[PDB]
Swiss-Prot record, chain A:
This is X-ray repair cross-complementing protein 6. Induction: In osteoblasts, by FGF2. Changing residue 10 to A: Abolishes adduct formation. The gene is XRCC6. Belongs to the ku70 family. Phosphorylation by PRKDC may enhance helicase activity. Single-stranded DNA-dependent ATP-dependent helicase that plays a key role in DNA non-homologous end joining (NHEJ) by recruiting DNA-PK to DNA. Required for double-strand break repair and V(D)J recombination. Also has a role in chromosome translocation. Has a role in chromosome translocation. The DNA helicase II complex binds preferentially to fork-like ends of double-stranded DNA in a cell cycle-dependent manner. It works in the 3'-5' direction.
From Swiss-Prot, chain B:
Changing residue 118 to D: Abolished ability to participate in V(D)J recombination. Transmembrane segments: none annotated. DNA repair protein involved in DNA non-homologous end joining (NHEJ); it is required for double-strand break (DSB) repair and V(D)J recombination and is also involved in telomere maintenance. Plays a key role in NHEJ by promoting the ligation of various mismatched and non-cohesive ends. Together with PAXX, collaborates with DNA polymerase lambda (POLL) to promote joining of non-cohesive DNA ends. May act in concert with XRCC5-XRCC6 (Ku) to stimulate XRCC4-mediated joining of blunt ends and several types of mismatched ends that are non-complementary or partially complementary. Changing residue 62 to E: Does not affect ability to participate in V(D)J recombination. Belongs to the XRCC4-XLF family. XLF subfamily. This is Non-homologous end-joining factor 1. Changing residue 66 to D: Abolished ability to repair double-strand breaks (DSBs). Abolished ability to participate in V(D)J recombination. Decreased interaction with XRCC4. Changing residue 58 to G: In IMD124; likely pathogenic; fails to translocate to the nucleus; decreased ability to repair double-strand breaks (DSBs); impaired ability to participate in V(D)J recombination. The gene is NHEJ1.
From Swiss-Prot, chain C:
It is linked to LIG4 syndrome: Characterized by immunodeficiency and developmental and growth delay. Patients display unusual facial features, microcephaly, growth and/or developmental delay, pancytopenia, and various skin abnormalities. Testis, thymus, prostate and heart. Belongs to the ATP-dependent DNA ligase family. Interacts with XRCC4; the LIG4-XRCC4 subcomplex has a 1:2 stoichiometry and XRCC4 is required for LIG4 stability. Component of the core long-range non-homologous end joining (NHEJ) complex (also named DNA-PK complex) composed of PRKDC, LIG4, XRCC4, XRCC6/Ku70, XRCC5/Ku86 and NHEJ1/XLF. Additional component of the NHEJ complex includes PAXX. Following autophosphorylation, PRKDC dissociates from DNA, leading to formation of the short-range NHEJ complex, composed of LIG4, XRCC4, XRCC6/Ku70, XRCC5/Ku86 and NHEJ1/XLF. Interacts with DCLRE1C; the interaction is direct. Interacts with APLF. It comes from Homo sapiens. It is found in: Nucleus. The chain holds residues 69 to 138 of 911 of the full protein. This is DNA ligase 4.
From Swiss-Prot, chain D:
Changing residue 105 to D: In XLF-Asp mutant; phospho-mimetic mutant; abolished ability to bridge DNA. Changing residue 19 to D: Abolished ability to participate in V(D)J recombination. This is Non-homologous end-joining factor 1. It is linked to Immunodeficiency 124, severe combined: A form of severe combined immunodeficiency (SCID), a genetically and clinically heterogeneous group of rare congenital disorders characterized by impairment of both humoral and cell-mediated immunity, leukopenia and low or absent antibody levels. Patients with SCID present in infancy with recurrent, persistent infections by opportunistic organisms. The common characteristic of all types of SCID is absence of T-cell-mediated cellular immunity due to a defect in T- cell development. Ubiquitously expressed. Changing residue 13 to K: Does not affect interaction with XRCC4. It comes from Homo sapiens. Disulfide bonds: none annotated.
Length: 51, 229, 70, 131
């Protein structure tokens, strides 16, 4: 999101592609999962697509 | 002796026997003094209690070349049968077969020990009304009543959790993920939906396998409670 | 100097009060501009939230930061 | 009770005048006893076990909802409503230790008639429909 903010032009689309093979990145820690969920919700609200 | 065999047979769980394209439910209690066996096929019940002399005579007759004391024979029979009753798919050689007569049932067991043959026959006569009652009718009623009590307790727990969820919602908060919302629990609606939808597949006793697989700890608990008083 | 900030004289004026601090928190945390949290921080005196405190900005910021902070 | 039979004598007043009847029952065959008591009771036990499983799953889902609400920063106004997480093993152990004796008491048959009669009828009707 910070990288997106730095851009000074007008962006019609904003996209992130996540290349991974770990379906449960945080299985040991539940708090990290909740933080990730909150941040993902905020990013979706801002208008950032996540794939 | 006889009392010990009867009490032991009472305290044991049911086991499933696959034999010659058919199924049976069996309870066996074998001790050095004799043995007791109860067989069923969900239509009739059969019982056989045997002391030492009968075992020795039958062993001499069938196994012509075997010469062993009754205690050793019963121990070998226990070692042969218990593995199959406790758990199936065991790597043990034990073939079972059943015959029929006007009333009796002959259950034939063929196996090998040290690779040498070992035959036994159970001559089970139709079980007396008291035995069938005490082993199936009353324990099953106790199991049903216990499960009903469990259902009521779990319903009370659900009501408590419903009240707490209602309090949390009244506080004004919201879920981070909305898919977890669960509707309020009404006992009548749940029972109606169950009876309409899931009862046909839940009440199918089939050939006895579900009873052995699911309801055995409760059966043993109920029977043990009955033994005490 | 932190227990008694009102008596500090070496440091100049920060230049930031409730409103500027709310705007900076919205910018840095990358919160939605029209979301519930941003509106609560900006209009922190309106009791429409009905939760926490309707007059304390520090408590509102604390509630906002609770799920986003170590 | 004489020999293996049972004479059930019923006396009454039909319009104020005597009315007698005597049922002469003989011990039921193993098939009737089975089809009327044993198989339906097994069906009832299995159905109630399925009900218990469904309720356990519902409790697990409500635990998930409560965990989500707690994580979201929600604070409950009344602290007495907190309910401990449900563990099936612990609940079963506590039940079998404490409440099994009273629940399992068959008695003289009254509890069976009072509680389990709708399930009995449903299981018997399903058996009849099947064949």
């Amino acid at each position: 999101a910070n990288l997106f903010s730095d851009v000074q032009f007008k962006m019609s689309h904003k996209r992130i592609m996540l290349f991974t093979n770990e379906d449960n990145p945080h299985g040991n820690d539940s708090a990290k999962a909740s933080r990730a969920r909150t941040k993902a919700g905020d990013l979706r609200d801002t208008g950032i697509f996540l794939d | 002796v006889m009392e010990e065999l009867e009490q032991g047979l009472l305290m044991q769980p049911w086991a499933w026997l696959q034999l010659a394209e058919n199924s049976l439910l069996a309870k066996v209690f074998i001790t050095k003094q004799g043995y007791a066996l109860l067989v069923s096929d969900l239509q009739q019940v059969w019982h056989e209690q045997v002391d030492t002399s009968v075992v020795s005579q039958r062993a001499k007759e069938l196994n012509k070349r075997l010469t062993a004391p009754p205690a050793a024979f019963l121990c070998h029979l226990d070692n042969l049968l218990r593995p199959l009753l406790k758990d199936a798919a065991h790597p043990s050689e034990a073939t079972f077969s059943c015959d029929c007569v006007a009333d009796a049932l002959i259950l034939r067991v063929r196996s090998e020990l040290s690779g040498l043959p070992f035959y036994w026959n159970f001559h089970c006569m139709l079980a007396s009304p008291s035995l069938v009652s005490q082993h199936l009718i009353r324990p099953l009623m106790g199991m049903s009543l216990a499960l009903q009590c469990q259902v009521r307790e779990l319903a009370t727990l659900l009501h408590m959790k419903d009240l707490e969820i209602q309090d949390y919602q009244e506080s004004g908060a919201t879920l981070i993920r909305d898919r977890l919302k669960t509707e309020p629990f009404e006992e009548n609606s749940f029972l109606e939906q169950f009876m309409i939808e899931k009862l046909p597949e839940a009440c199918s006793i089939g050939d006895g396998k579900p009873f052995v697989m699911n309801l055995q700890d409760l059966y043993m608990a109920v029977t043990t409670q009955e033994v005490q008083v | 100097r932190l227990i008694l900030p009102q008596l500090e004289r070496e440091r100049m004026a920060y230049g930031i009060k409730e409103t500027m601090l709310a705007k900076l928190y919205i910018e840095l945390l990358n919160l939605p501009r029209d979301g519930k949290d941003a509106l609560k921080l900006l209009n922190y005196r309106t009791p429409t939230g009905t939760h926490g405190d309707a007059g304390d900005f520090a408590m509102i910021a604390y509630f906002v930061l609770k799920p986003r902070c170590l | 009770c004489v020999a293996d039979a049972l004479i059930l004598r019923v006396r009454s007043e039909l319009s104020g005048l005597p009315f007698y009847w005597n049922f002469h029952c003989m011990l039921a065959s193993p098939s009737l006893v089975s089809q009327h008591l044993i198989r339906p009771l097994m069906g009832m036990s299995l159905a109630l076990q399925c009900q218990v499983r469904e309720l356990a799953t519902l409790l697990h889902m409500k635990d998930l909802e409560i965990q989500d609400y707690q994580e979201s920063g929600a604070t409950l106004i009344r602290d007495r409503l907190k309910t401990e997480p449900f563990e099936e093993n612990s609940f079963l152990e506590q039940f079998m230790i404490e409440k099994l004796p009273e629940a399992c008491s068959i008695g003289d048959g009254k509890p069976f008639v009072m509680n389990l009669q709708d399930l009995y009828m449903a299981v018997t009707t399903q058996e009849v429909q099947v064949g």
